[PDB]
Structure formats: C-alpha cells, structure tokens
C-alpha cells in the first residue's frame, strides 16, 4: 500500500533542512515539468521550540514556545518516511505548485503553518513531531 500520502510525517535527509521533520501537504507521484520525478510539497519546522521546566515564568514559556516553520518541494529520495502522522485541516491546501513562484505567497503560507503548528504544540499533542531528532 502507498504511505506517501497527505499528513504523512517524514524526515528530510538532504539540503539545508536535513534532519528536520516535515508533514506532507501534497504528494506528486507522477512528477511535473519543473520536477520530472516523484516528489512532495511539505511543511516543517526549522527551529524547534525549546524545553520548558516547571520553574520558568510565563513570559519565558511563551518566548521559548515559538516555532519557525518552512515550506519545501522535496524529492522522494531525500525523505525518510515515518510511521507517525499529523492530520491538520489548517494545513489543508496551504501550499500548491504556484505558491513557490511568488515570495509573498511563501511568507503567507509560512505564517499559516506557524499558527497551526503553534496551536497544535500548545495543545500538547504529537510530541514526537515537535521534539528535534538527535544525530
């Protein structure tokens, strides 16, 4: 069965975002003219939130709970798929192929991804996605 679907959590293995965790927004198995290979449109975390201890103040907690996101077109050979999933309709069709052709659309998509991911992190669920991978 196919596992490179929407809301699939993958690990990026090459590029500037190597070692980061992403969620698949759109799988393009057949490829496009710009990318004549199986690839995916993903959104992920560039800067993970810092650890929170029981004696921190509220201002320090809300400062360290910030998340820096990114959006990416990535080859299938540069992804390591994981069994975990992250289902968000706030990220549903947040990016398309034409999103990456305009810098402002990338900023708006990154703002939306930041808001949704920060809400999910503050919920306290899917802790493995917001925990950085150590290697």
């Amino acid at each position: 069965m196919k596992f490179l679907k929407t809301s699939r959590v993958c690990l990026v293995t090459r590029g500037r975002y190597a070692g980061k965790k992403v969620v698949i927004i759109q799988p393009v198995d057949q490829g496009t003219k710009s990318h004549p290979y199986g690839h995916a449109l993903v959104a992920g975390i560039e800067r993970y939130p810092s650890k929170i201890t029981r004696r921190m103040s509220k201002a320090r907690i809300e400062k360290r709970s910030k998340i820096k996101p990114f959006i990416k077109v990535i080859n299938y050979n540069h992804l390591m798929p994981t069994r975990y999933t992250l289902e968000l309709e706030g990220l549903k069709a947040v990016i398309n192929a034409d999103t990456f052709k305009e810098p402002s659309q990338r900023e708006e998509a990154k703002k939306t991804v930041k808001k949704v991911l920060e809400d999910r992190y503050n919920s306290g669920k899917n802790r493995w996605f917001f925990t950085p991978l150590r290697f």
Partner: protein, 98 residues
C-alpha cells in the same frame, strides 16, 4: 578634634572621577531630592489636583485596556489549543533518454 578641608596612590583615578550611570530616560543626572510641584500638596490647588487626577485616570484607563487585550489574547490562544487538542483526539479516534 579633627577638621577636614583645612606605594600609596595619593591621587584619585580618572575612572573614579567618572560620573555614575543614570537610569533616567533622557540620560541626565536625577537630583537627590527633586523639587515637589503644587499638585503634591496635602491641600493642593484645584487646577493642579485636577491635572494630576486626569493624568493618573488616563494612565489607569490605558493600563486596564492593555490588560483586557492581553487577557483576551490568552483566552483565544487557549481556545485554539483546546480545539487542536480535540482535533488530535478525534484523529486518534478514527485512526484506531538523451
């Protein structure tokens, strides 16, 4: 008795002659006892008392407005977190040649 004003470093350093740091916003030296105004009297003039009252009233108004705004922002943040948590619980629910 003793009356002042009438190798060991007998001179003082220029670093000691340097003036201390002032915490004032404009950077000038704050007096030790600043001169009080007429509005600080126990039986003040009506104009001075009204001016001080209006200044403190508008400061209290803007402080309370800021507090209400940040409380509403915190409430919206925790509501969004709770909605995402319900989303995650529901997700676990239906998850279970050239």
């Amino acid at each position: 008795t003793y009356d002042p004003w009438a190798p060991d470093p007998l001179k003082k350093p220029k670093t000691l002659e340097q003036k201390p740091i002032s915490l004032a916003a404009n950077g000038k030296s704050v007096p030790a006892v600043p001169k009080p105004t007429g509005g600080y009297s126990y039986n003040p003039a009506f104009t001075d008392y009204q001016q001080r009252l209006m200044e403190e009233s508008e400061k209290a108004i803007e402080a309370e407005r800021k507090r209400l705004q940040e409380l509403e922002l915190e409430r919206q943040k925790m509501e969004a977190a709770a909605r995402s948590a319900a989303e995650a619980e529901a997700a676990e629910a239906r998850a279970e040649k050239p």
